Amino acid sequence: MNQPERYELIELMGLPKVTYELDSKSPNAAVVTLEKEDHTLANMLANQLLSDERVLFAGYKVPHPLNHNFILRVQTVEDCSPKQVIVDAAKSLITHLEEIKVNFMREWELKMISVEGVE
Amino acid sequence: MIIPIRCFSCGKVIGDKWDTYLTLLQEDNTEGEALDKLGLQRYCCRRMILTHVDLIEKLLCYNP
Amino acid sequence: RIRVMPYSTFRLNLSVTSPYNADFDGDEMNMHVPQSEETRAEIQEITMVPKQ
Amino acid sequence: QEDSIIMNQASIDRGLFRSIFYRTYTDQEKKIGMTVMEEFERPVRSTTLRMKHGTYDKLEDDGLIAPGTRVSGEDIIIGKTAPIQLHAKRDVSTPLRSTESGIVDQVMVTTNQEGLKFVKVRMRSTRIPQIGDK
Amino acid sequence: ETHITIRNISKNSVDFVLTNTSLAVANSLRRVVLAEIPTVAIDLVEINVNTSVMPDEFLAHRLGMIPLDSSNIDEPPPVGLEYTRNCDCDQYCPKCSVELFLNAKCTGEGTMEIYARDLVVSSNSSLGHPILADPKSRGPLICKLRKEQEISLRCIAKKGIAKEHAKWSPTSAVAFEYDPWNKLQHTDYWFENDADAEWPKSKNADWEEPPREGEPFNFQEEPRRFYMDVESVGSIPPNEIMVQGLRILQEKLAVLVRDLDEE
Amino acid sequence: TMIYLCADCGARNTIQAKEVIRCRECGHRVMYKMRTKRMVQFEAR
Ligand SMILES: [Mg+2]
Ligand SMILES: [Zn+2]
Ligand SMILES: [Zn+2]
Ligand SMILES: [Zn+2]
């Protein structure tokens, strides 16, 4: 009866998927608010985003398990950017994903042969 | 009433795996252990065919 | 201070459960909304989970 | 926390603790008189008085609903009438508590003695687990 | 380099091992596969006559979970239909939703047993066709009947992800276990009388160390090597799921970049 | 007027308003009501 609409979990109600906004405090550091997409994309740009020596902070946390979104704070400090730090990250990811998407499509058919066939 | 279809915890389909189940614990002299021969390694859902009550044979006989 | 979630129960704050000597055994709790802007003031400046 | 539990939605989606809630509405046909009739006729907004927020648009020619018509709200399901231009038809028909919803399982129309008609309506309303259930 | 090292496969599950990668990505792959992976499933029934014992409400929920073929899906126009929500057509149309039929009657007097077989698609080799997990059977069970209890149902499937209802995920579960001994001590085992003595070594434990010493334990070490094991429902071939996992995971990272380099 | 159905036989009683509640080629005196047409909107959840 007061069950939020499920489809309002996978569809931005005219809500700007991403939003990039500096802070104050902190200086040279901004806070990103991706919406209707979280708990997956977020964890990556972290346990990986922190891998760039350029970084000095890596936010990430869902404010409430009812709202389907999440913030991300990055500080850096000192030259750029940090809209560029997370993109350099995202890019390093998509490309690191295929690294495995290919090995998969490569080793699959390769151990499909040993279980008979034929052709 | 009739098997749940799709176990409660996973997705493992169980609608298919009963017309065949019952034809062992009462028709092949194999144990409750026999379901293991149906790909039930997890707890899990396999307590699905096991903890089930056939409430339809005993409901179907009320003909209008 | 209300606001405002969905699903049909009253979410309230665990550290406030002791004063209401009552768990979540499916308990009910009543809500009384003020009207006039002169009481809204009383139960804000004197009676408040904080000042209590 | 403190005597409370959190349940997996995936499960409740496949049927954990899904239940049904049949409710049934009894209604006869009193007759005092003299000879005062009171049939289950469909109320006619031409000389009734009084009943609004219907809608009676869900009653058949029989003045009774047909399963399994999606009934919700304060919808009505039976219709009464009691004599007294354009006079006179009253309305002692029973509505449906808004707090309930869902379709209509089946209805059973028999005879009482008494000596008139006698209807029973049952509606089903699936109930899923929701935050706040015991 | 590598990255994956598969072991056994079957027709419903795919056991393998990740290599050069981080924890995050692992989990973030576990999740992906369990949720946002487009599939077909039925999400609307119209009943005409039903004098059986399962109520209409009870059939909808049941006719739903029964898996269907999906295969390609993300490849329109044909052999794949885009979400029925963002469709170029109005309301509901076969161009973005597959119609299904169920006209079950009774010609016997003993007892009927209607399976997933009796349904009827349309003939648009989508598909489409449900599945038949059962061995040379006819599919998952739907309902039973006695005398004259014919039911007539119109079913149409849409496209959806687990997120929207557990009904869609074509994925059973997943079975990972990074660091099977206890290198990084990411866990404090409860004794009760003797530690490495109460807890069972795992089948996947025979692929590593670091017993002996007293090195002492390391710490510059991050968790790599993850022993996953994906199992599908039977709705769509056993990966499939995995393959289509990253395809809509890369594209989820992209969304981001494009919303930051354009402006 | 409409049609009704008996608790046992089920044969079409097609009986008239204000009369007597019963059957025709049999006995007992109750009766339910045929399900409407009626293609009804049903979510699968
Ligand atoms: Mg107590
Ligand atoms: Zn299970
Ligand atoms: Zn369409
Ligand atoms: Zn009869």
- With helix as H, strand as E and coil as C, how does chain E read? CCCECCCCECCCEEEEEECCCCHHHHHHHHHHHHCCCCEEEEEEEEEEEECCCCCHHHHHHHHHHCCECCCCCCCCCCCCCCCCCCCCCCCCCHHHCEEEEEEECCCCCCCEEEEHHHCECCCCCCCCCECCCCCCCCCCEEEEECCCCCEEEEEEEEEECHHHCCCCCCECCCCCCCCCCCCCCCCCCCCCCCCCCCCCCCHHHCCCCCCCCCCCCCCCCCCCCEEEEEEECCCCCCCCCCHHHHHHHHHHHHHHHHHHHCC
First to last CA, chain A: 58
Say if the Cβ atoms of F44 and E44 lie within 8 Å.
Answer: yes
D1 vs C8, C14, C25: nearest CB: C14
- State both tokens at D67: 């399963």
Q: Is the bond into B46 cis (omega within 30 degrees of 0)?
A: no
Q: Is the bond into E213 cis (omega within 30 degrees of 0)?
A: no
**Tokens 């009796």 sit on residue:** E118
What's the E214 CA to ligand 4 centre distance in angstroms?
Answer: 88
Helix (H) or strand (E) run with residue D108 in it? strand D106-111
CB distance from F32 to chain D under 8 Å?
yes
Report DSSP state, residue A13.
S
Sign of CA dihedral D124, D10, C11, A18: negative
Alpha carbon dihedral D30, D34, D35, D38, in 10-degree steps, equals -30
**Tokens 């665990």 sit on residue:** C14
Q: How many CB pairs under 8 A join A and E?
A: 105
Q: Which residues contact F35 (CB under 8 A, 6 or more apart)?
A: D66, D67, D68, E49, E50, E51
D13 CB neighbours in chain F (<8 A) are 45
CATH code of residue F14:
2.20.28.30
What's the D3 CA to ligand 1 centre distance in angstroms?
Answer: 9
Distance CA F42, CA E64 (A): 11
What ligand is nearest to the CA atom of residue F5?
4
Query: Strand pairing partners for E15?
Result: E229
**CB D73 within 8 Å of CB D56:** no
Q: State how far residue E165 is from chain D, nearest Cα, in angstroms.
A: 7
| b (16+ CB within 10 A) / e for E20-44 | ebbbbbbbbbbbbbbbbbbbbbbbb
Identify the domain containing residue D32 by its residue range. 19-128
CB distance from D124 to chain F under 8 Å?
no
- Name the nearest CA neighbour of D18 among B4, B46, E24: B4
CB distance from D105 to chain E under 8 Å?
yes
- State both tokens at B59: 């409901």
E12 CB neighbours in chain B (<8 A) are 39
CA atoms within 13 A on the CB side of A63: 11
3-class DSSP state for residue C49? coil
Of D3, D57, D62, D91, catalytic: D3
What ligand is nearest to the CA atom of residue F15?
4
- Strands of D117-123's sheet, edge to edge? D23-27, D117-123, D106-111
Q: Which chains touch D (3+ CB pairs under 8 A)? A: B, C, E, F
String of DSSP letters for D44-106: -TTS--S--S--GGG--TTSS--TT----TT-----------------------TT------E
List the single residue in E with minimal CA-CA distance to F33: E51
String of DSSP letters for A22-90: E-SSSTTEEEEEEES--SSHHHHHHHTGGGSTT-S----B-S-TTS-EEEEEEE--SSS-SHHHHHHHH
Say if the Cβ atoms of E57 and D124 lie within 8 Å.
Answer: yes
As for chain D, the residues directly before each break of C–N over 2.5 Å are 84
CB distance from B43 to chain D under 8 Å?
no
- Name the nearest CA neighbour of A73 among A42, A108, A106, A99: A42
Q: Is the bond into A118 cis (omega within 30 degrees of 0)?
A: yes
Helix (H) or strand (E) run with residue A107 in it? helix A83-107
Distance CA A101, CA A99 (A): 6
Residue E169, Cβ density class (10 Å: 0-12 exposed, 13-18 middle, ≥19 buried): buried
Around Cβ A40, how many Cβ atoms within 10 Å? Answer: 19
Distance CA D92, CA D78 (A): 10
Experimental method: X-ray
**CB E177 within 8 Å of CB E132:** no
Residue D105 annotated among the catalytic residues of the structure: no
Distance CA B8, CA E65 (A): 11
- State both tokens at F41: 């909107």
Q: What angle do CA E141, E142, E148 make, to 5 degrees?
A: 120
**CB A28 within 8 Å of CB A76:** yes
Backbone phi, psi, residue E234, to 5°: 125, 5
**CB A83 within 8 Å of CB A98:** no
- What chain E holds in terms of domains, given with CATH numbers, is 1-38+167-263 (3.30.1360.10), 39-166 (2.170.120.12)
Say if the Cβ atoms of A3 and C5 lie within 8 Å.
Answer: no
**CB D107 within 8 Å of CB F33:** yes
Residue E233, Cβ density class (10 Å: 0-12 exposed, 13-18 middle, ≥19 buried): buried
Query: Strand pairing partners for E104?
Result: E151
What's the E107 CA to ligand 1 centre distance in angstroms?
Answer: 58
Q: Which residues contact E112 (CB under 8 A, 6 or more apart)?
A: E104, E106, E144, E145, E146, E149
Q: State how far residue C3 is from chain A, nearest Cα, in angstroms.
A: 14
CATH code of residue A63:
3.30.1360.10
Q: What angle do CA E205, E32, E189 make, to 5 degrees?
A: 35
Resolution to 1 decimal, in Å? 3.7
**CB E158 within 8 Å of CB E94:** no
Q: Does the annotation flag C11 for ligand binding? A: no
Domain count, chain F: 1
Distance CA E41, CA E208 (A): 42
Report DSSP state, residue A99.
H
Sign of CA dihedral B22, B23, B24, B28: positive
Identify the domain containing residue F37 by its residue range. 1-45
The one-letter amino acid at E26: A
A43 vs E27, E243, E246: nearest CB: E27
3-class DSSP state for residue F5? strand
Report DSSP state, residue F12.
B
- State both tokens at A86: 């997370």
Distance CA F19, CA F34 (A): 19
Distance CA A91, CA A73 (A): 18
C23 vs D2, D132, D134: nearest CB: D2
**CB D122 within 8 Å of CB E75:** no
List the single residue in B with minimal CA-CA distance to E67: B13
Angle between helical axes of A83-107 and E23-34 (0-180°, round to 10): 70
CB distance from F33 to chain E under 8 Å?
no
C-alpha to C-alpha distances, A31 to A27, A71, A73, D97, E209, nearest whole angstrom: 12, 6, 4, 50, 42
Sign of CA dihedral A9, A12, A17, A22: negative
**CB E32 within 8 Å of CB A40:** yes
CB distance from E6 to chain A under 8 Å?
yes
**CB D42 within 8 Å of CB D56:** yes
What's the E109 CA to ligand 4 centre distance in angstroms?
Answer: 20
- State both tokens at A94: 């998509």
The one-letter amino acid at E178: Y
C-alpha to C-alpha distances, B31 to B25, B27, E166, nearest whole angstrom: 6, 10, 32
CA atoms within 13 A on the CB side of D36: 14
E55 vs D10, D15, D124: nearest CB: D124
CA atoms within 13 A on the CB side of D25: 19
Strands E39-50 and E151-160, sheet pairing: antiparallel
**CB E229 within 8 Å of CB E13:** yes
Strands E151-160 and F40-42, sheet pairing: unpaired
Around Cβ B6, how many Cβ atoms within 10 Å? Answer: 27
Backbone phi, psi, residue E155, to 5°: -115, 135
CB distance from F44 to chain E under 8 Å?
yes
Q: State how far residue E48 is from chain D, nearest Cα, in angstroms.
A: 10
**CB D110 within 8 Å of CB F5:** no
Distance CA D54, CA D46 (A): 15
Q: Which chains touch C (3+ CB pairs under 8 A)? A: A, D
Around Cβ D122, how many Cβ atoms within 10 Å? Answer: 15
What's the E44 CA to ligand 3 centre distance in angstroms?
Answer: 14
3-class DSSP state for residue C13? coil
E56 vs D13, D18, D103: nearest CB: D103
Q: Does domain B1-64 have CATH number 3.40.50.11900?
A: no
Compute and round to an integer the Cα radius of gyration of chain E. 24
**CB A45 within 8 Å of CB A72:** yes
String of DSSP letters for B2-64: ---SS-SSS----SSSSTTTHHHHTSSS--GGGGGGGS--SSSSHHHHHT---TTHHHHTT--
Specify whether the backbone of E28 is left (phi greater than 0), alpha (psi in -120 to 50) or beta: alpha
Q: Which residues contact E258 (CB under 8 A, 6 or more apart)?
A: none
Query: Strand pairing partners for D107?
Result: D121
CA atoms within 13 A on the CB side of E42: 30
Alpha carbon dihedral B37, B43, B48, B51, in 10-degree steps, equals 100
Q: Which residues contact A101 (CB under 8 A, 6 or more apart)?
A: E243, E246, E247, E250
Q: State how far residue F36 is from chain E, nearest Cα, in angstroms.
A: 8
What ligand is nearest to the CA atom of residue D2?
1
- Name the nearest CA neighbour of E245 among E6, E14, E84, E1: E14
- Name the nearest CA neighbour of D69 among D121, D118, D18: D121
Q: Which residues contact D2 (CB under 8 A, 6 or more apart)?
A: C14, C17, C23, C24
**CB D104 within 8 Å of CB D121:** yes
Domain locations in chain B as residue ranges = 1-64
Residues in chain F, overall count = 45
The one-letter amino acid at E222: E
CB distance from C11 to chain A under 8 Å?
no
| b (16+ CB within 10 A) / e for D86-120 | eeebbeebeebeeeebbbbbbbbbbbeeeebbbbb
Q: Which residues contact E129 (CB under 8 A, 6 or more apart)?
A: E68, E69, E121
C-alpha to C-alpha distances, E8 to A111, A114, E16, E161, E228, nearest whole angstrom: 9, 11, 7, 28, 12
Domain count, chain A: 1
